[PDB]
């Protein structure tokens, strides 16, 4: 239990997918207007990551790993296509569930569900799992922790942007520039965990 707790804590804080690895920045910057919208997007990302990482682990270990399928034959060059296809299929099925017969929560999220496929955070998490050679349980835990960390970062940014309703940003910086500066400051704050080796 202690090992998995350490892994989850590391994934959430010491290797924050958004503010330590800087992946997913397009949607992280664009959809940070409202706290609840960011919350829904973060929960969707959590589901996608936690379902994608273990399946990719299984596929890689059973087929793509060198000598896994046939001795002397390695198909490691199919890693990118396999990962992207699995992620796309999972996201398509989840959207088919959401914008349809189970829970009409699709609406508010709108056009970002299709963009969850090209969210660099999920692909980077799968790549990091492949590099680190995790087990299946370690996979599940790492995916869940990475999703939780990304959701936390996005929610914090949304809260800050909601607080900025009182601000007086110059006209040129109003919009994207001030958000970029705010994200940089948030990363500066998150640099407190750099030296920790959990």
């Amino acid at each position: 239990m202690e090992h998995y707790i350490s892994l989850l804590v590391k994934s959430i804080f010491i290797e924050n997918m958004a503010l330590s690895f800087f992946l997913g920045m397009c949607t992280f910057l664009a959809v940070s207007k409202k706290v609840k919208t960011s919350f829904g997007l973060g929960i969707a990302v959590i589901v996608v990551l936690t379902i994608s990482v273990p399946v990719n682990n299984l596929v890689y270990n059973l087929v793509l790993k060198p000598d896994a399928l046939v001795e002397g034959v390695d198909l490691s060059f199919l890693n990118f296509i396999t990962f992207i296809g699995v992620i796309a299929a999972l996201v398509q099925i989840l959207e088919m569930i959401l914008d349809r017969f189970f829970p009409p929560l699709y609406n508010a999220l709108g056009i970002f569900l299709p963009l969850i496929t090209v969210n660099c955070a999920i692909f980077g998490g799968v790549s990091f799992m492949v590099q680190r050679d995790y087990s299946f349980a370690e996979s599940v835990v790492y995916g869940f922790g990475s999703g939780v960390g990304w959701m936390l970062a996005i929610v914090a940014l949304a809260g800050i942007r909601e607080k900025m309703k009182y601000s007086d940003v110059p006209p040129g910086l109003r919009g994207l520039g001030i958000t970029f500066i705010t994200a940089g400051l948030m990363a500066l704050g998150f640099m407190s965990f750099s030296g920790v080796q959990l």
Binding site: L75, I93, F101
Partner: protein
């Protein structure tokens, strides 16, 4: 070599398996059924529709005169209906045309409401009463340097159901027309040397649609009369094409085919005792004529009316005979006009400058209670600005100012 074969087969199988999984999941997670679009409606009025797409597409396919104006453009905002069951959630882009006080009653824009499940429609005030007619030109007579009046003949002894100030829709096919085809008299045609409009021509390769207001009044039975302005290129870059259907309508003459549809209007007059003030310029005389004739002759009530008009020069004013006859038999009405640029042949002796300044300085400056009157307005853009500004500086509230612009 073996690695190549293994990679090919593995690529193919992985992609095929993912595609098969997606298709199988679709068969369960999408209904793939059929639903009926319910209407305020009688039980057979419903429309059968497989789910998918916007709601307005099924109403248009069923031949219903669903509300729409300005050819759509995603900005007209006239595509609103009321839905009682199944309306779903409002799309944020609707808020620019629907207020918070109106959205809570279930009013939705037909463009945005997707037909994804069964719904019930309370179509407003029986839109089914709208019709379209095939029609013949009675006359197309010029009246000003850029204004012409079109007279129209309803078939089978019918008369369009309308109230004063309403408008009808007009459509034109793919057509080519040139300014040399026009039949404008020289008295009006001499002023076109400003841009040498005789050089100009226009053409379109697919049908278009616009709307026009009606210069007649409800008890002017059997005909629809319109006032049309020849849309000319703007002066800053006058090399651009002229008005596509303005030119087409300008070229028609007596006996030619025409079609009309969509009798509509939100410019109806309020039913009160208080005084009425009509103000307009240029081509805006048609709704004013409609309102004044309708009130004087149909309603017959003894209210107080006034009409103010602005124009460029004296050769731009018409309907003087009609307004003078109305005034000669009704003391409740009076008409005044002013000229921005009275020309040497005008021999003008009346008020000059823009009509808002004339109105304020001569009538409203001394008015006992200007906020109690009703102001109907339609005219050039700077009339559209200045009249509203001057009225609002006198304390006149919005609910007493009614504006009918020419579609922005």
């Amino acid at each position: 070599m073996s690695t190549i074969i293994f990679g090919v087969v593995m690529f193919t199988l992985i992609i095929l398996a993912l595609v098969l999984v997606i298709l199988f999941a679709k068969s369960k997670l999408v209904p793939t059924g059929d639903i009926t679009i319910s209407i305020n409606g009688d039980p057979e009025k419903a429309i059968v529709t497989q789910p998918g797409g916007k709601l307005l597409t099924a109403l248009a396919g069923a031949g219903v005169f669903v509300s729409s104006a300005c050819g759509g453009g995603g900005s007209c905002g006239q595509c609103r209906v009321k839905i009682k069951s199944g309306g779903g959630d409002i799309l944020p882009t609707e808020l620019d045309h629907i207020s918070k006080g109106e959205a809570r009653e279930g009013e939705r824009l037909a463009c945005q409401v997707a037909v994804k499940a069964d719904m019930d429609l309370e179509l407003p005030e029986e839109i089914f009463g709208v019709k379209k007619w095939e029609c013949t030109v009675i006359s197309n007579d010029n009246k000003a340097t850029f204004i012409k009046e079109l007279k129209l003949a309803i078939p089978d002894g019918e008369s369009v159901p309308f109230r004063a100030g309403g408008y009808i829709q007009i459509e034109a096919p793919a057509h080519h027309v040139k300014y040399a085809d026009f039949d404008v008299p020289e008295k009006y045609r001499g002023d076109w040397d400003k841009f040498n409009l005789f050089r100009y021509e226009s053409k379109v390769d697919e049908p278009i649609i616009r709307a026009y207001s009606m210069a007649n009044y409800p008890e002017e039975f059997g005909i629809i009369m319109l006032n049309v302005r020849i849309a000319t290129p703007p002066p800053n870059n006058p090399n651009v094409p002229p008005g596509q259907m303005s030119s087409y309508i300008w070229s028609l003459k007596a006996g030619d085919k025409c079609t009309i549809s969509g009798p509509f209007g939100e410019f109806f007059a309020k039913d009160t005792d208080a005084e009425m003030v009509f103000i307009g310029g240029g081509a805006g005389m048609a709704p004013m004529r409609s309102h004044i004739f309708d009130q004087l002759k149909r309603l017959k009530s003894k209210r107080k009316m006034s009409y103010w008009y602005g124009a460029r020069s004296k050769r731009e004013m018409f309907y003087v005979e009609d307004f003078d006859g109305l005034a000669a038999e009704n003391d409740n009405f009076v008409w005044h006009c002013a000229l921005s640029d009275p020309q040497p042949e005008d021999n003008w002796t009346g008020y000059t400058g823009f009509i808002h300044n004339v109105l304020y300085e001569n009538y409203l400056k001394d008015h006992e209670a200007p906020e109690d009157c009703e102001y109907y307005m339609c005219g050039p853009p700077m009339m559209n600005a200045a009249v509203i500004n001057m009225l609002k500086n006198l304390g006149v509230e919005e609910e007493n100012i009614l504006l009918d612009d020419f579609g922005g």
